[PDB]
Amino acid sequence: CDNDNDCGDGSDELPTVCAFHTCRSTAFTCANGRCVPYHYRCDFYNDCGDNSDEAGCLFRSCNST
Amino acid sequence: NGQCITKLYVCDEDNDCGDGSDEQEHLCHTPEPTCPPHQFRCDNGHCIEMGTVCNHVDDCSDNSDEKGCGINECQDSSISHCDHNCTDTITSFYCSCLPGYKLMSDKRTCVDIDECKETPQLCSQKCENV
Ligand SMILES: *[C@@H]1O[C@H](CO)[C@@H](O)[C@H](O)[C@H]1NC(C)=O
Ligand SMILES: *[C@@H]1O[C@H](CO)[C@@H](O)[C@H](O)[C@H]1NC(C)=O
Ligand SMILES: *[C@@H]1O[C@H](CO)[C@H](O)[C@H](O)[C@H]1NC(C)=O
Ligand SMILES: *[C@@H]1O[C@H](CO)[C@H](O)[C@H](O)[C@H]1NC(C)=O
Ligand SMILES: *[C@@H]1O[C@H](CO)[C@H](O)[C@H](O)[C@H]1NC(C)=O
Ligand SMILES: [Ca+2]
Ligand SMILES: [Ca+2]
Ligand SMILES: [Ca+2]
Ligand SMILES: [Ca+2]
Numbered sequence: 001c002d003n004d005n006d007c008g009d010g011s012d013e014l015p016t017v018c019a020f021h022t023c024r025s026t027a028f029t030c031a032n033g034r035c036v037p038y039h040y041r042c043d044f045y046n047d048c049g050d051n052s053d054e055a056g057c058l059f060r061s062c063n064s065t
Numbered sequence: 066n067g068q069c070i071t072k073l074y075v076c077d078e079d080n081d082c083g084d085g086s087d088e089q090e091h092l093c094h095t096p097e098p099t100c101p102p103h104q105f106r107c108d109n110g111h112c113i114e115m116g117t118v119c120n121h122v123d124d125c126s127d128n129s130d131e132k133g134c135g136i137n138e139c140q141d142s143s144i145s146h147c148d149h150n151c152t153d154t155i156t157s158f159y160c161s162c163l164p165g166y167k168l169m170s171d172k173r174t175c176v177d178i179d180e181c182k183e184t185p186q187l188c189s190q191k192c193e194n195v
């Protein structure tokens with residue numbers, strides 16, 4: 001249930017298998033039903049599909065000290 | 066050479082021991098560790114056969130092996146907002162500044178080296194930064 005059509009014609013991601021799926025609770029949860037570790041969120045990479053992992057964060061990225 | 070020096074002297078860029086045992090590179094510095102050249106290293110201290118890095122299966126404890134394989138970051142200005150030059154890699158990418166410039170912790174910004182302050186021995190009389 002990674003939201004990818006691995007099994008040829010999309011047969012692995014069908015609703016009757018994935019419908020009640022959840023992922024390890026420490027990981028981030030994404031709008032399209034895909035999970036990436038929480039640190040992946042907002043690192044300029046759209047690791048989750050579309051852009052909901054990056055969307056909304058302020059990209060403060062330098063050593064303020 | 067048969068000499069005793071205080072422990073603070075052992076690595077301070079001074080040949081206190083005349084044989085130059087003091088200041089030996091193997092003593093004062095550690096090379097970045099690697100693994101067989103036929104292999105690959107993820108962010109964590111792990112080394113895997115290189116073919117595995119893009120096999121769609123997470124190998125590293127941090128799952129960072131598979132993350133980079135699909136993106137040519139230099140062609141994607143959003144991720145690669147580099148100041149001078151960018152180069153792709155099967156995992157992630159690297160960014161580099163032109164000669165005379167240095168890179169900053171965001172690993173994308175470039176800044177101008179004050180060569181006079183950083184290396185005053187460059188000019189025998191006076192130095193001016195540009
Ligand atoms: C800033 O850099 C110093 C080393 O130059 C490092 O010790 C420190 O942890 C860094 N701080 C942050 C917030 O990144
Ligand atoms: C690096 O970037 C500079 C400035 O854009 C450019 O003049 C130079 O040709 C580039 N070098 C390479 C190897 O891409
Ligand atoms: C997935 O999360 C749900 C909560 O919505 C339940 O905890 C369920 O037991 C979980 N199943 C697993 C182990 O993924
Ligand atoms: C060698 O490198 C490691 C990190 O890989 C540590 O920074 C360590 O302190 C280094 N040792 C010396 C003697 O510089
Ligand atoms: C990387 O480190 C290993 C272990 O020390 C071997 O020395 C190998 O030869 C090194 N390879 C490189 C690239 O220096
Ligand atoms: Ca799938
Ligand atoms: Ca991300
Ligand atoms: Ca010394
Ligand atoms: Ca892998």
Ligand SMILES: [Ca+2]
Nearest residue numbers: 136154156157
């Ligand atoms: Ca890449």
